[PDB]
């Protein structure tokens with residue numbers, strides 16, 4: 369429901385509070401409309417996002433995304449997300465998908481927000497799929513925040529292409545992404561893939577001593593939630609992280625490159641990890657392809673579509 373007089377901030381005890389991030393009674397007019405709003409953190413000192421509860425109108429909402437950043441794109445009450453999520457780096461934290469219910473964060477794992485370094489804003493993205501009561505929508509996510517230092521820190525290792533070109537009518541275009549991991553060990557517990565209409569399959573592995581350990585494999589045309597990892601996977605100083613997207617050009621009249629519009633593409637694998645608080649960092653990114661010849665021994669599963 370829509371909040372009203374009671375406010376978005378709910379105390380749970382002396383150190384915990386829930387924060388409801390809701391669309392400010394919005395009303396769409398077209399199909400596939402993307403709405404976005406932001407919420408400054410109520411505390412200025414450091415806190416840990418320890419849990420998420422979805423509050424979605426199961427009739428209208430296709431998916432939701434929650435980000436953490438410091439410069440939301442619009443100082444507005446809400447905006448068309450085409451304008452942008454964040455001017456700075458948008459950190460993904462939560463992803464709700466309609467027909468793919470999210471898995472909870474492991475216990476003891478939490479994101480670092482606020483303080484000197486952590487995110488100062490939450491930004492919410494709500495995709496509306498199908499559209500007549502003239503109702504004002506307040507769908508969103510309720511977020512459990514604590515000030516208690518969590519022993520394990522959640523983080524994101526984003527893997528993304530940039531230089532990809534998909535020629536028109538080209539049967540198979542591969543986008544390889546590879547990086548050497550150079551931090552304290554991390555443990556991947558969930559993953560999410562992102563592609564636009566041209567992607568067929570996305571796969572992420574850990575290569576250690578020349579052997580591929582599957583992190584995640586998915587059709588990007590399937591709902592784009594965070595799916596849990598079958599068996600938790602440690603990546604460690606030395607290991608190489610490797611991802612491939614498979615694209616088709618068939619159907620397109622002109623060549624497609626990486627971009628933000630629906631006629632552009634994207635090969636994004638979001639690896640969600642946790643680290644020991646004392647070693648932890650919160651976000652890593654790989655946009656390089658440091659070991660391209662290594663992809664010669666990529667598992668055949670990464671090329672056959674699920």
Ligand SMILES: O=N[O-]
Nearest residue numbers: 553555601602603
């Ligand atoms: O992450 N070694 O069990």
Ligand SMILES: O=N[O-]
Nearest residue numbers: 627628629630634
């Ligand atoms: O997923 N649209 O860039």
Ligand SMILES: [Cu+2]
Nearest residue numbers: 562563628634
């Ligand atoms: Cu995209």
Ligand code: NI
Nearest residue numbers: 555600601602
């Ligand atoms: Ni382990």
